[PDB]
Amino acid sequence: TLGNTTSSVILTNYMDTQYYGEIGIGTPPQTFKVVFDTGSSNVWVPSSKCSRLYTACVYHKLFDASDSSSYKHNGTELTLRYSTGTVSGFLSQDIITVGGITVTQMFGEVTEMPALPFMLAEFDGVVGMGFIEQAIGRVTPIFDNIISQGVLKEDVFSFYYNRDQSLGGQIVLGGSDPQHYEGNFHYINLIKTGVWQIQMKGVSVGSSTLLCEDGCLALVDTGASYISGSTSSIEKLMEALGAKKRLFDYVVKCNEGPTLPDISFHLGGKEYTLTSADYVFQESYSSKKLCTLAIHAMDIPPPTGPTWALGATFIRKFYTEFDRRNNRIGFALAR
Numbered sequence: 369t370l371g372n373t374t375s376s377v378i379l380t381n382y383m384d385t386q387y388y389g390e391i392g393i394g395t396p397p398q399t400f401k402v403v404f405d406t407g408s409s410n411v412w413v414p415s416s417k418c419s420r421l422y423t424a425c426v427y428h429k430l431f432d433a434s435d436s437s438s439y440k441h442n443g444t445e446l447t448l449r450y451s452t453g454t455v456s457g458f459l460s461q462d463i464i465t466v467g468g469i470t471v472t473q474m475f476g477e478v479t480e481m482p483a484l485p486f487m488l489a490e491f492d493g494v495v496g497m498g499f500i501e502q503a504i505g506r507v508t509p510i511f512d513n514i515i516s517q518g519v520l521k522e523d524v525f526s527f528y529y530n531r532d533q534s535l536g537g538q539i540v541l542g543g544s545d546p547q548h549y550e551g552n553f554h555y556i557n558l559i560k561t562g563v564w565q566i567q568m569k570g571v572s573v574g575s576s577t578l579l580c581e582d583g584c585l586a587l588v589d590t591g592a593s594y595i596s597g598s599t600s601s602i603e604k605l606m607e608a609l610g611a612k613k614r615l616f617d618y619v620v621k622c623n624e625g626p627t628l629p630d631i632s633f634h635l636g637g638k639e640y641t642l643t644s645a646d647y648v649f650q651e652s653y654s655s656k657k658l659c660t661l662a663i664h665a666m667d668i669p670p671p672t673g674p675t676w677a678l679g680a681t682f683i684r685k686f687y688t689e690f691d692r693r694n695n696r697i698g699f700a701l702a703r
């Protein structure tokens with residue numbers, strides 16, 4: 369069912385690495401800073417029921433079901449395995465406020481939140497923008513619940529991620545905001561419904577298509593800070609860029625940053641190009657300092673992986689529209 373409503377959620381940009389918005393859970397609302405993640409399908413926040421020995425829980429807003437008059441018990445155990453770290457808890461139902469829309473939602477109350485990476489999170493939890501097919505415990509995702517209300521103008525949602533005291537970013541539910549892109553959208557259909565993954569025809573470092581020569585997978589992940597490939601793809605890519613491995617990232621000598629070649633991603637018709645300004649954290653120009661790159665190795669496990677993941681590094685340059693109606697992703701040059 370379609371209506372007229374488009375709803376927007378203002379995002380906060382934390383150091384070009386974390387982009388989060390705010391949602392309200394319960395009556396009265398308990399507000400949480402949440403990542404709107406297309407790479408996952410579950411909604412979750414840290415629970416009041418989380419032990420004060422998980423230091424992550426000490427530094428994040430906890431959901432207290434005993435303060436909500438709209439809370440409905442469930443209690444089913446839930447383990448959400450991301451490849452950066454793992455969270456577990458149990459299921460709860462309450463009213464979720466997301467940019468003007470009020471939806472009764474089944475979410476996870478996280479009781480096991482590991483310091484790594486959650487002590488580094490500026491966000492409290494996650495709002496999964498992925499499909500039911502990838503929902504742990506087959507829980508109806510928030511977007512499907514909002515689509516059911518028959519209020520949205522279109523069965524689409526869009527991401528705008530800015531570059532780091534202005535607008536950090538914006539999600540528009542039920543359409544796109546033309547103030548944030550220019551030109552026209554170019555769509556690439558999904559390999560299959562259930563995952564925001566598209567076929568990638570090749571990755572070129574410089575003028576020559578050095579990688580993904582015989583085609584590969586590209587997951588459009590709004591919950592990811594960087595553009596990621598498999599350990600092997602990143603090894604070849606990084607050798608071509610002249611980058612050194614450092615444990616958690618890849619660096620180049622700061623002076624070498626601007627001179628690095630453009631990286632292009634063949635998606636659908638078009639070539640989506642990123643210059644060294646689009647992927648280097650140019651914090652200095654010193655030959656005596658090491659500058660990190662906004663491209664990391666990430667081995668996503670099967671069935672979704674092995675795949676490339678186009679995160680915030682990509683979405684910054686290209687405004688993204690996720691079409692639930694036509695099972696496709698659209699890209700336009702961001703403003």
Ligand SMILES: COCCCOc1cc(C(=O)N(C[C@@H]2CNC[C@H]2Cc2ccccc2)C(C)C)ccc1OC
Nearest residue numbers: 385386387403407450451452485488489591592593680
């Ligand atoms: C751009 O800003 C967003 C936040 C970036 O910062 C952080 C992000 C994360 C993090 O990795 N994810 C889950 C990733 C992304 N989509 C699903 C999954 C990968 C995957 C795994 C398996 C299959 C598909 C995809 C979150 C959202 C829990 C952890 C710590 C962070 O900082 C401390």
Ligand SMILES: *[C@@H]1O[C@H](CO)[C@@H](O)[C@H](O)[C@H]1NC(C)=O
Nearest residue numbers: 441442443444459474507508
């Ligand atoms: C928990 O929620 C699911 C629906 O998501 C439902 O089918 C199940 O019966 C619920 N269990 C309890 C204990 O309420």
